Amino acid sequence: KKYAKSKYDFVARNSSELSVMKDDVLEILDDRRQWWKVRNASGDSGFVPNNILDIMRTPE
Amino acid sequence: KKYAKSKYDFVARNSSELSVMKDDVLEILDDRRQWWKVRNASGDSGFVPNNILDIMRTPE
Numbered sequence: 159k160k161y162a163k164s165k166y167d168f169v170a171r172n173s174s175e176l177s178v179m180k181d182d183v184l185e186i187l188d189d190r191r192q193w194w195k196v197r198n199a200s201g202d203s204g205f206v207p208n209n210i211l212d213i214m215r216t217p218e
Numbered sequence: 219k220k221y222a223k224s225k226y227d228f229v230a231r232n233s234s235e236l237s238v239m240k241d242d243v244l245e246i247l248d249d250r251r252q253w254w255k256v257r258n259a260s261g262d263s264g265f266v267p268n269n270i271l272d273i274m275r276t277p278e
Contacts, residue, residue: 160273160274161273161274162254162256162268162271162272162273162274163271163272163274164266164270164271164272165270165271165272166270168266168267168270170264173233173234174233174234174235174264174265175264175265175266176256176258176262176263176264176265176266178256178266178270182259183259183274184256184257184258184266184271185256185257185258186254186255186256186257186273187254187255187256187257187263188254188255190254191254191255192252192253192254192268193251193252193253193254193255193265194246194247194251194252194253195246195247195248195251195253195265196222196236196244196245196246196247197244197245197247198236198238198242198244198245199242199243202236203236203247204230204235204236204237205234205235205236205253205265206224206228206235206236206238206244207228208251208252210224210225210226210228210238211222211223211224211225211244212222212223212225213220213221213222214221214222214223214243
């Protein structure tokens with residue numbers, strides 16, 4: 159299993175965020191995958207893997 | 219304001235995840251989220267920003 163040690167304190171915001179403490183020892187789930195906090199058209203925010211998307215841009 | 223389109227679908231297993239449909243346009247909260255799914259020494263599970271998380275590893 160994976161293990162990371164919190165360097166600082168982290169106050170969760172939403173029920174999907176885990177509030178940790180400095181020196182807290184966490185277990186990395188989902189093979190260290192990387193997620194992003196997103197907001198859908200509906201409004202509800204959430205967590206989605208960054209793996210699944212392609213960025214968008216508008217040349218002004 | 220950041221935006222990205224979902225290349226694929228993503229079914230959220232639990233409740234701490236955001237389900238997304240193919241070709242779904244999502245807004246990017248912060249741009250460098252890069253969140254991991256971690257687990258508490260209490261059993262709790264959620265999302266935490268990796269920049270404050272130090273990977274534990276065997277010495278050398």
